[PDB]
Protein backbone atom coordinates (compact mmCIF):
# COMPACT_ATOMS: atom_id res chain seq x y z
CA UNK A 1 0.00 0.00 0.00
CA UNK A 2 0.92 3.73 -0.50
CA UNK A 3 2.08 5.20 2.23
CA UNK A 4 -0.47 8.92 3.40
CA UNK A 5 1.58 11.58 3.85
CA UNK A 6 1.73 12.64 7.43
CA UNK A 7 3.51 15.44 10.27
CA UNK A 8 4.93 13.36 12.70
CA UNK A 9 4.14 10.08 13.66
CA UNK A 10 5.67 6.65 15.55
CA UNK A 11 6.35 5.69 19.01
CA UNK A 12 5.60 7.97 21.87
CA UNK A 13 7.83 10.09 23.99
CA UNK A 14 7.53 10.64 27.67
CA UNK A 15 5.85 14.21 28.70
CA UNK A 16 5.02 16.88 26.50
CA UNK A 17 3.01 16.33 23.59
CA UNK A 18 2.65 14.99 20.24
CA UNK A 19 0.13 15.73 17.47
CA UNK A 20 -0.12 12.52 15.62
CA UNK A 21 -1.80 12.62 12.19
CA UNK A 22 -2.10 10.99 9.13
CA UNK A 23 -3.28 11.86 6.08
CA UNK A 24 -7.26 11.18 4.89
CA UNK A 25 -8.43 10.10 1.59
CA UNK A 26 -10.92 12.85 0.98
CA UNK A 27 -10.37 16.38 0.41
CA UNK A 28 -11.30 19.42 2.25
CA UNK A 29 -13.62 17.26 3.87
CA UNK A 30 -13.64 16.76 7.37
CA UNK A 31 -16.96 14.72 7.91
CA UNK A 32 -14.32 11.22 8.72
CA UNK A 33 -12.96 9.29 11.18
CA UNK A 34 -9.69 8.10 12.38
CA UNK A 35 -7.98 4.73 14.08
CA UNK A 36 -4.79 4.89 15.27
CA UNK A 37 -4.63 1.02 16.85
CA UNK A 38 -1.64 -0.66 16.79
CA UNK A 39 -1.55 -4.64 16.15
CA UNK A 40 1.74 -6.46 17.51
CA UNK A 41 1.90 -9.72 19.38
CA UNK A 42 1.17 -9.81 22.97
CA UNK A 43 0.24 -7.89 25.59
CA UNK A 44 2.40 -4.71 25.16
CA UNK A 45 -0.82 -2.98 23.54
CA UNK A 46 -2.89 0.39 24.77
CA UNK A 47 -6.47 1.41 24.12
CA UNK A 48 -6.38 4.35 21.71
CA UNK A 49 -9.20 6.89 21.61
CA UNK A 50 -11.53 7.14 18.29
CA UNK A 51 -13.27 9.93 16.38
CA UNK A 52 -16.35 9.50 15.06
CA UNK A 53 -17.59 10.50 11.20
CA UNK A 54 -19.95 13.24 12.99
CA UNK A 55 -17.12 14.68 15.13
CA UNK A 56 -19.24 16.11 17.68
CA UNK A 57 -18.30 13.60 20.36
CA UNK A 58 -14.88 13.13 20.57
CA UNK A 59 -12.38 10.42 21.83
CA UNK A 60 -13.62 7.42 24.50
CA UNK A 61 -13.53 10.39 27.00
CA UNK A 62 -16.35 12.67 25.34
CA UNK A 63 -16.62 16.00 24.90
CA UNK A 64 -16.94 16.97 28.17
CA UNK A 65 -13.37 16.79 29.57
CA UNK A 66 -11.82 16.03 25.67
CA UNK A 67 -10.71 18.97 23.15
CA UNK A 68 -11.77 19.37 19.35
CA UNK A 69 -9.55 17.61 16.97
CA UNK A 70 -8.67 19.53 14.18
CA UNK A 71 -9.57 17.58 10.74
CA UNK A 72 -9.52 20.00 7.76
CA UNK A 73 -6.79 21.65 5.97
CA UNK A 74 -6.04 23.55 2.98
CA UNK A 75 -2.43 21.99 1.47
CA UNK A 76 -3.46 18.54 2.40
CA UNK A 77 -6.45 16.94 4.20
CA UNK A 78 -5.24 15.86 7.66
CA UNK A 79 -6.56 14.58 11.19
CA UNK A 80 -4.92 16.09 14.08
CA UNK A 81 -4.75 14.61 17.76
CA UNK A 82 -3.57 15.16 20.84
CA UNK A 83 -2.15 12.17 23.13
CA UNK A 84 -2.50 11.75 26.74
CA UNK A 85 0.15 10.41 28.65
CA UNK A 86 1.12 6.93 28.43
CA UNK A 87 4.13 4.55 28.66
CA UNK A 88 7.03 5.31 26.37
CA UNK A 89 7.06 1.01 26.03
CA UNK A 90 6.04 -0.03 22.97
CA UNK A 91 6.36 -2.66 20.22
CA UNK A 92 4.16 -2.66 17.67
CA UNK A 93 4.78 -1.56 13.98
CA UNK A 94 3.79 1.79 12.74
CA UNK A 95 2.82 2.54 9.52
CA UNK A 96 0.41 5.48 8.30
CA UNK A 97 -1.21 4.54 5.24
CA UNK A 98 -4.82 4.15 3.82
CA UNK A 99 -6.79 2.66 6.57
CA UNK A 100 -8.22 -0.84 6.34
CA UNK A 101 -11.69 0.50 8.05
CA UNK A 102 -13.92 3.57 6.91
CA UNK A 103 -16.72 2.82 9.04
CA UNK A 104 -15.50 4.77 11.74
CA UNK A 105 -17.88 4.33 15.13
CA UNK A 106 -17.77 5.14 18.74
CA UNK A 107 -16.85 1.05 19.27
CA UNK A 108 -14.56 -0.09 22.00
CA UNK A 109 -13.83 -3.66 20.93
CA UNK A 110 -13.41 -2.45 17.72
CA UNK A 111 -9.72 -2.19 16.27
CA UNK A 112 -7.72 -1.00 13.33
CA UNK A 113 -7.09 -4.05 11.94
CA UNK A 114 -7.10 -8.15 13.24
CA UNK A 115 -3.46 -8.98 11.88
CA UNK A 116 -0.31 -6.90 11.02
CA UNK A 117 1.23 -5.86 8.21
CA UNK A 118 4.25 -3.84 6.31
CA UNK A 119 5.57 -1.63 8.43
CA UNK A 120 8.86 -0.42 10.11
CA UNK A 121 10.18 -2.63 13.05
CA UNK A 122 10.94 -0.06 15.02
CA UNK A 123 10.52 -1.37 19.22
CA UNK A 124 11.90 -0.39 22.15
CA UNK A 125 10.54 -3.62 24.47
CA UNK A 126 12.60 -6.78 22.99
CA UNK B 1 -31.42 -8.02 36.16
CA UNK B 2 -34.23 -9.88 35.43
CA UNK B 3 -35.52 -12.48 33.00
CA UNK B 4 -32.21 -12.82 30.71
CA UNK B 5 -29.38 -15.28 30.05
CA UNK B 6 -26.28 -15.05 27.97
CA UNK B 7 -26.14 -14.58 23.96
CA UNK B 8 -27.58 -18.40 23.41
CA UNK B 9 -30.74 -17.21 25.43
CA UNK B 10 -30.49 -13.58 25.43
CA UNK B 11 -34.22 -12.22 25.95
CA UNK B 12 -36.11 -10.12 23.04
CA UNK B 13 -38.23 -7.46 23.43
CA UNK B 14 -39.65 -3.65 21.76
CA UNK B 15 -42.40 -1.56 22.92
CA UNK B 16 -42.51 2.43 22.53
CA UNK B 17 -42.64 2.62 26.80
CA UNK B 18 -39.41 3.85 27.83
CA UNK B 19 -35.59 3.01 27.52
CA UNK B 20 -33.35 1.12 29.22
CA UNK B 21 -31.16 2.50 32.15
CA UNK B 22 -28.43 2.82 29.86
CA UNK B 23 -28.76 6.06 28.93
CA UNK B 24 -27.97 7.85 32.70
CA UNK B 25 -24.54 7.75 31.36
CA UNK B 26 -25.85 9.52 28.42
CA UNK B 27 -26.30 13.00 30.12
CA UNK B 28 -22.61 13.68 31.66
CA UNK B 29 -20.54 10.63 31.54
CA UNK B 30 -21.33 9.46 28.35
CA UNK B 31 -18.40 6.78 28.39
CA UNK B 32 -17.40 4.45 25.25
CA UNK B 33 -20.60 2.32 27.35
CA UNK B 34 -22.21 3.27 24.01
CA UNK B 35 -20.73 1.24 21.44
CA UNK B 36 -21.20 2.56 17.89
CA UNK B 37 -20.36 0.91 14.55
CA UNK B 38 -20.21 3.53 11.85
CA UNK B 39 -22.36 5.79 13.13
CA UNK B 40 -22.15 8.34 16.38
CA UNK B 41 -24.35 7.90 19.67
CA UNK B 42 -25.39 11.79 18.46
CA UNK B 43 -27.25 10.42 14.80
CA UNK B 44 -29.48 8.56 17.22
CA UNK B 45 -31.30 11.40 18.20
CA UNK B 46 -31.34 13.23 15.11
CA UNK B 47 -33.07 9.96 13.23
CA UNK B 48 -33.09 6.00 13.88
CA UNK B 49 -32.40 2.84 12.43
CA UNK C 1 -50.07 0.63 8.68
CA UNK C 2 -46.27 0.63 7.90
CA UNK C 3 -46.39 -2.57 10.31
CA UNK C 4 -47.53 -1.10 12.90
CA UNK C 5 -50.28 -2.13 14.84
CA UNK C 6 -52.71 0.27 16.81
CA UNK C 7 -55.02 -0.67 19.62
CA UNK C 8 -57.58 1.79 20.33
CA UNK C 9 -60.33 1.77 23.30
CA UNK C 10 -62.91 3.33 25.23
CA UNK C 11 -65.46 2.93 27.95
CA UNK C 12 -68.86 4.23 28.33
CA UNK C 13 -71.57 3.04 31.11
CA UNK C 14 -74.85 2.36 29.62
CA UNK C 15 -78.30 0.63 30.03
CA UNK C 16 -79.54 -1.53 26.71
CA UNK C 17 -81.10 -4.41 26.29
CA UNK C 18 -80.26 -4.70 22.35
CA UNK C 19 -78.88 -2.83 19.98
CA UNK C 20 -75.78 -0.32 19.96
CA UNK C 21 -76.42 3.24 21.58
CA UNK C 22 -76.49 6.87 20.54
CA UNK C 23 -74.03 9.23 21.00
CA UNK C 24 -70.60 10.19 20.11
CA UNK C 25 -67.21 8.89 21.61
CA UNK C 26 -63.50 8.84 20.92
CA UNK C 27 -61.65 6.24 21.21
CA UNK C 28 -58.58 6.97 23.05
CA UNK C 29 -55.02 5.54 21.98
CA UNK C 30 -54.02 2.25 23.65
CA UNK C 31 -50.74 0.59 22.35
CA UNK C 32 -48.85 0.44 19.13
CA UNK C 33 -47.73 -2.84 18.17
CA UNK C 34 -44.27 -2.76 15.87
CA UNK C 35 -44.70 -6.94 15.28
CA UNK C 36 -45.46 -6.22 11.42
CA UNK C 37 -46.72 -9.52 10.52
CA UNK C 38 -49.17 -9.77 8.29
CA UNK C 39 -52.41 -9.76 8.80
CA UNK C 40 -55.38 -11.05 6.71
CA UNK C 41 -58.27 -12.51 9.17
CA UNK C 42 -59.19 -12.28 12.96
CA UNK C 43 -61.25 -14.31 15.58
CA UNK C 44 -62.87 -13.26 18.83
CA UNK C 45 -62.22 -14.98 22.80
CA UNK C 46 -65.29 -15.76 24.74
CA UNK C 47 -65.45 -17.42 28.18
CA UNK C 48 -67.64 -20.44 28.20
CA UNK C 49 -69.16 -22.21 31.55
Known amino acids: QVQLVESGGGLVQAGGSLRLSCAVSGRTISTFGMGWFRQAPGKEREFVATITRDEDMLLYADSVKGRFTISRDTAKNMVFLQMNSLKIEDTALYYC???????????????????WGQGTQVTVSS | ATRFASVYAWNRKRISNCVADYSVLYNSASFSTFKCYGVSPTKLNDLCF | IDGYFKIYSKHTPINLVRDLPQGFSALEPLVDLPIGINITRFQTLLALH
Open chain 1, 97 to 115: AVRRDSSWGYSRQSTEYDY
